[PDB]
Design a binder for these strands. Sequence first.
RNA 1: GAGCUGUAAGCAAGCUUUGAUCCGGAGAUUUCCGAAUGGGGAAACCCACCACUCGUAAUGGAGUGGUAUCCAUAUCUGAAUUCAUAGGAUAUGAGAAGGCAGACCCGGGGAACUGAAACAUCUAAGUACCCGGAGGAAGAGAAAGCAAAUGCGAUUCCCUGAGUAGCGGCGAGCGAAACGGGAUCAGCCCAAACCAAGAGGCUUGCCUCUUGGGGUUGUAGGACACUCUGUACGGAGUUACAAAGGAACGAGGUAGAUGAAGAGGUCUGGAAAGGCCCGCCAUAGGAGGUAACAGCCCUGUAGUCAAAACUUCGUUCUCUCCUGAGUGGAUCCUGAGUACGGCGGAACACGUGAAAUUCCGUCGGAAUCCGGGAGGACCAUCUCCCAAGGCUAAAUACUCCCUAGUGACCGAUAGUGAACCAGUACCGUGAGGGAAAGGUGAAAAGCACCCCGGAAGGGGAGUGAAAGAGAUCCUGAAACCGUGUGCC
RNA 2: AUGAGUAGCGAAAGAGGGGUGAGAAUCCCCUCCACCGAAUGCCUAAGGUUUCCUGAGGAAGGCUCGUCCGCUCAGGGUUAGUCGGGACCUAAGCCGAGGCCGAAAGGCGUAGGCGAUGGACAACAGGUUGAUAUUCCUGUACCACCUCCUCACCAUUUGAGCA
Lengths: 65, 93, 100
Amino acid sequence: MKANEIRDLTTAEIEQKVKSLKEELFNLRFQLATGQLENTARIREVRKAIARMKTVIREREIAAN
Amino acid sequence: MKDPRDVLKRPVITERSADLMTEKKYTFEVDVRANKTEVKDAVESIFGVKVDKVNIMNYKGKSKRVGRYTGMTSRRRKAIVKLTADSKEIEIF
Amino acid sequence: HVKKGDKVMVISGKDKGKQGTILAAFPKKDRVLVEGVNMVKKHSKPTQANPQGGISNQEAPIHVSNVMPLDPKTGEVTRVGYKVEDGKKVRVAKKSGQVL
RNA sequence: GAGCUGUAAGCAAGCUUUGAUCCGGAGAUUUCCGAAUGGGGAAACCCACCACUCGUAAUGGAGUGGUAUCCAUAUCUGAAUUCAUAGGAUAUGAGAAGGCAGACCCGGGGAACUGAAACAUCUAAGUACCCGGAGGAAGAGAAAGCAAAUGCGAUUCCCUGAGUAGCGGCGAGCGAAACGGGAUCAGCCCAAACCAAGAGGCUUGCCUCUUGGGGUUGUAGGACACUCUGUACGGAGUUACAAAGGAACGAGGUAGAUGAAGAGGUCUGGAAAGGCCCGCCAUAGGAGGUAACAGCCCUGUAGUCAAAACUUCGUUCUCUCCUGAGUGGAUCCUGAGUACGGCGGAACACGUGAAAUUCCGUCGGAAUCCGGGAGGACCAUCUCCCAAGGCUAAAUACUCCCUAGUGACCGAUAGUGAACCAGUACCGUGAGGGAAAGGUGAAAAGCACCCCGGAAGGGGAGUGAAAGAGAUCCUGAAACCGUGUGCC
RNA sequence: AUGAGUAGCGAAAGAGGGGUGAGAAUCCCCUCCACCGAAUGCCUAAGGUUUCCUGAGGAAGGCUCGUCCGCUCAGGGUUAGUCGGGACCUAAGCCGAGGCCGAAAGGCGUAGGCGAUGGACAACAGGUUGAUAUUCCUGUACCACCUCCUCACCAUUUGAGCA
């Protein structure tokens, strides 16, 4: 998904992207705490996706100078 | 930086928690370095309700003895928020 | 030198002569699980199932050096050798000119 | 190139041939403490100021950057006082003080026990230890030398000289050097001193300012002065001798690829790698596994090959850098702290003495080449050599590491204190001291079911080659504790 | 191993009836009886660190027993503008920019700081859970700061504020 990450422009790669993933992780952890989640690999894959987005943004910023 | 969803971690569900929840009070676990004001704003932003007061407290770690080894569990910080009478109720499932 | 889903022939042990297919592989310990070989009578744990259950007949792993494959052409035991690079490295038989 | 989500064996939930997991090169993120550096502090924590930014009107609320002391560089500002102190603001210094490898080397302080059959002089010993500097090695270097003829030619290290010459309550003891044989190689070089030009200070004058130029200088002959020489072609190959850089080839290091030949028959066994009867491979009988002892079963070995990317050497090209010889009449000869006088030290193998030689404090204190030093007090002849300014690779020392190996070395009271969650458990206020503890089976195939019992534990039945193999589960001795019985 | 089934079992009043349980001199309930009361009462330092509350347990620890426990295994429990400390002050002492001494390492010390055992400083009654309460709940209060939008008297050296 890294290529698709590059294709998006910078604001789109943070605004309404690293925010929806954050809120989804929040809801997922709430459901797990309550006691009804079933599928549990979602947490790990969401966290990995967030890290990917942050790293590509930082790479762009570093290359900009 | 300091997104509001970073302050709240997970709800607390015991008999005491439900007893308090009967009276428009809700119990959370929050980050160990966050003061009451960020908790208040975070609850206001995430759910969209009205907050009246917040009370906070600190907990220590516990010693366990699994096997022949010994260790300790991590510290905790707990918050109790009280909504106003007009505000709606937070849908804690 | 052999993987899952291959016809092999056991050449040593109490089951020499028998042959079958591979059902699982354990590259970590060099053990393989050939079908119909090395049967065991496992005394199942107290209930923990719809019936009680105390007598089963399943397979047990065999060391990988005790099996080795069959030649497609002649049809017997044959040593293995790589490097045909027909667009990709591919296993070949030595006592023949064939593949896999 | 087929399974995978660490020990870790449960258990759900998932991913991968659109190639995972995994191995190597380069990148990104990196909470708080710690030299710790915004201020403070009982290491792991509290409290700020200035710029922006989020949020309401502010606060404390929140986020991102900056703010230590000292040293060098410029600036403007200058007390008492018409100047210099002192004060600000700059870019600093990728400060470096901080750490370590319990090793190796330079320098400054510097013991005692012990020996001498007691003990001062001696020895232990410039050792142990403390402090300050470093570097991958440091230190030492191009004769004011050895020495005694035929003389050799910077330093360092090994063999021999030799337990010799010498010191010494002449005791105990300490203890050289040169000559000769080797390892590496460097006649390695640089400095404004006499002079010149110019400038620019500068009262005429000066005296620094930059340039040439000069010292591979002693047989005292060089240099300043005085007749030639070709300045491109040699040296750096940047390792002393000025110093910055590029571009191509080759060999390595960090990951890998390929790789010959028996299921031979037969016997015993739970299981053949073993016995007997037969064959093959070899630049490959080095190793480790597999249900017993394998060159032909597996991972491999001998040989051949390999790299996007970082790195280590070598060669070449580019590329920078300007000279060496004949002649005598004044001047420089680079170097004024030498060498004394006590007085102490101080090192010399040498203990102040017959004593040369080297350094450190304190008083006086040179001449100039028709000069000066040395040849173990001085004393005249002869023979060697020119101090008071710098730089220099190689041959040597030592392992915290990394890679590959090897032992007429150990085999669990041995070998590291530690083969096991060891500097742990325990002991101490603290510096500090410091253990015990390996083995089921080839494979859990780790005892369904029945009976006694609250359970623990047994008796059957089953798995296994073995259950006397059943969880500190290979073999299992002695002390020690019991039951039965032949003779007293 | 012997000594040896020997010495000891660490100041104190219990008795009966029920209960539970495989099992009770030792555990729960009841009734009588006994002991302390300028404490053996309550609240709370230093120090300890989960020992606190509820449900299970019967290997080891309790100088006996044990169905019990400050023991073992799982879950829970500690709420502050006013209470104690920090965004306040200093004592003895300690550290110390420049500075003065000293083979080095270091010793002392000015400006300035740190440091309570002291000085300043706004909240009281009642109720409640198996485990917290001047903190939670109900009543009545006080203190410092701001004007988001206000309101009424009252505005520039005709001085409000100022140490």
